[PDB]
Design a binder for this molecule. Structure first.
Ligand SMILES: NC(=O)c1ccc[n+]([C@@H]2O[C@H](COP(=O)([O-])OP(=O)(O)OC[C@H]3O[C@@H](n4cnc5c(N)ncnc54)[C@H](OP(=O)(O)O)[C@@H]3O)[C@@H](O)[C@H]2O)c1
Ligand SMILES: CCc1nc(N)nc(N)c1OCCCOc1cccc(CCC(=O)O)c1
Length: 163
């Protein structure tokens, strides 16, 4: 089982200036609960985007997709393709693809689940933004109710499964 997990603004922004252009502790806790104990697969720019206290993501096997021989920053297992990241895989569990836009694009044809956090922040897409992947007719989805964060931002979760 291969799952994509991401947080996006309503406008579909996931990334800006090498990071995430909002702060949402409730999403981080959701991300922790779904990924803890599992393999997380990410592109190299997302690896470098991790704050130092979260690089590597503790309690998860961190696999980084790169075309380089290896990385200066420690704690990852490097692979040269998504296929190499995904096999062999943890039994009875999802392998989570955790971004960014380039690796979501590679992983979307292979995924059977998407877990999306939508953040009601007003972020018109800017020229160099990373955007969320668009899901096609092969996905069925359900949506949770709108929630309010302690910081006042409204957010909700969407869960998609491959038909
Ligand atoms: N909101 C969210 O949920 C979320 C989640 C994750 C990340 N983000 C944001 O997304 C942005 C980063 O995303 P991004 O799309 O720019 O980068 P990315 O997908 O994280 O990483 C791109 C890198 O992956 C490697 N790569 C890409 N395609 C490859 C292939 N076919 N084979 C081998 N390696 C390949 C390359 O590494 P090398 O250059 O090393 O060869 C490439 O530079 C940041 O702003 C980050 O904060 C947001
Ligand atoms: C939690 C964001 C997220 N949320 C969901 N739902 N899915 C994801 N794939 C996803 O990104 C995982 C990779 C980035 O991890 C972190 C982890 C901790 C703190 C930050 C701050 C970003 C900054 O300071 O710019 C980023």
């Amino acid at each position: 089982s291969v799952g994509l997990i991401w947080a996006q603004s309503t406008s579909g922004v996931i990334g800006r200036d090498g990071g995430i252009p909002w702060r949402l502790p409730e999403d981080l806790a959701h991300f922790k609960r779904l990924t803890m104990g599992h393999t997380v697969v990410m592109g190299r720019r997302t690896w470098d985007s991790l704050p130092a206290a979260h690089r590597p993501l503790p309690g998860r096997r961190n696999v980084v997709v790169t075309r380089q021989t290896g990385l200066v920053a420690h704690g990852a297992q490097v692979v040269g393709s998504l296929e190499q990241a995904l096999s062999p895989a943890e039994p009875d569990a999802a392998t989570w693809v955790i971004g960014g836009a380039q690796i979501y694009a590679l992983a979307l044809p292979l995924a059977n689940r998407c877990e999306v956090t939508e953040v009601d922040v007003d972020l018109p897409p800017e020229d160099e933004d990373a955007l969320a992947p668009v899901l096609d007719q092969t996905w069925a989805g359900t949506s949770g109710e709108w929630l309010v964060s302690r910081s006042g931002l409204r957010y909700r979760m969407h869960s998609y499964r491959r038909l």
